[PDB]
Amino acid sequence: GVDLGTENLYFQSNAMLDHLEQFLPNKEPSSIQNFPFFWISQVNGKYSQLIEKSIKKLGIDNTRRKIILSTNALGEASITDIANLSTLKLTTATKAVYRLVEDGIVEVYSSTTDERISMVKLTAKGVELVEQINQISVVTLAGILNAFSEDELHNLNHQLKKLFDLMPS
Amino acid sequence: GVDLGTENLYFQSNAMLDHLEQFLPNKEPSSIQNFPFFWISQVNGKYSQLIEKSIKKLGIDNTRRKIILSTNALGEASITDIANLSTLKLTTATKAVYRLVEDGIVEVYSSTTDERISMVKLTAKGVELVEQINQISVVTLAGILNAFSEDELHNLNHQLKKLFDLMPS
Ligand SMILES: O=C(O)Cc1c[nH]c2ccccc12
Ligand SMILES: O=C(O)Cc1c[nH]c2ccccc12
Ligand code: NI
Ligand code: NI
């Protein structure tokens, strides 16, 4: 029984349920490998270990790495926005931003449009560390992503986006 | 400079680097949305919030949920194997298994082939909670995954697997 945004409760078609059972973990030892979120979780976890392990050298962690690349891409950003893009809790994000200010990697500054919003931007040191991050990326990633065509990867991004956009909160 | 498993260091072709730069976060505000791991991370995080939030009712968390569905699919499993499949640290896994024994959801038992290996299996209560997990899955997931064809989803699983298999440790 779902509500689909209403004051009533709806029991979905046995069709929707059959299709969904083609993908759900069940009593069969290989059900799990049909589940797209299983694979998203497994890929995220194996990737997370790889990147943490190799970004080691630069004496930062992947939390700081994402903050820096989000600031880089955006130029100036909402700590909020950086957190969002970096898949972080706002508290985790704020904590790591100040750790990067303390290291002289980013400048934080009151937003000109609205003093409350803390904007973030790189320092000269921030920018050199970006190229270092990009080079460690080259090393660890070039083989993996050169194993796919431009078509496969753009398609995969599209499907991941479609998934991301159907989920709510 | 990479080693590719040898005693020498190799500088990859400017080709591999150009292709890789089609996908990496860079100074362009939309570089990030070309990056497959960005999307894997974002989907994993949005999914994680959704499932934790809705598995709430059953008074378990998604860590326990995955343990139960891995035990379910396998019948009897290595706590090791359950941890692996559930994308958990072995310590996290062992901790949650005993929490589920304490709740009478799983039986733990010395492996018949090798007494050290702790095997896990469901209880009658475990099995009823499986169908409850499957029904909460129906509610929260049926819409999202009925938004894709069988072809799109099997393809997406395949590409995620290919990624998972090229990464190492
Ligand atoms: O969190 C999820 O739903 C995905 C997932 C990762 N490992 C799993 C093991 C069993 C069932 C689902 C999953
Ligand atoms: O962890 C990753 O590499 C993926 C990712 C998630 N959010 C990001 C923001 C900027 C750059 C990469 C990422
Ligand atoms: Ni997960
Ligand atoms: Ni990540």
Numbering used by the authors:
A (entry chain A), B (entry chain A): -14 to 154
What does the paper behind this entry write?
We characterize the binding of IAA to MarR-family regulators from both iac and iad loci. Most characterized MarR-family regulators function as repressors by binding to an operator sequence upstream of the genes they control. When a relevant ligand binds the MarR repressor, it releases from DNA, allowing gene expression. The structures of MarRs from representatives of each auxin degradation operon type establish that each has distinct IAA-binding pockets.
MarR proteins were produced from three iad and three iac loci and their binding affinities for IAA were measured. Crystal structures for the IAA-binding IacR MarRs from P. putida, E. soli and A. baumannii and IadR MarR from B. japonicum were determined and refined to 1.5–2.8 Å resolution. We also provide crystal structures of MarR regulators from P. putida, E. soli, Bradyrhizobium japonicum and A. baumannii.
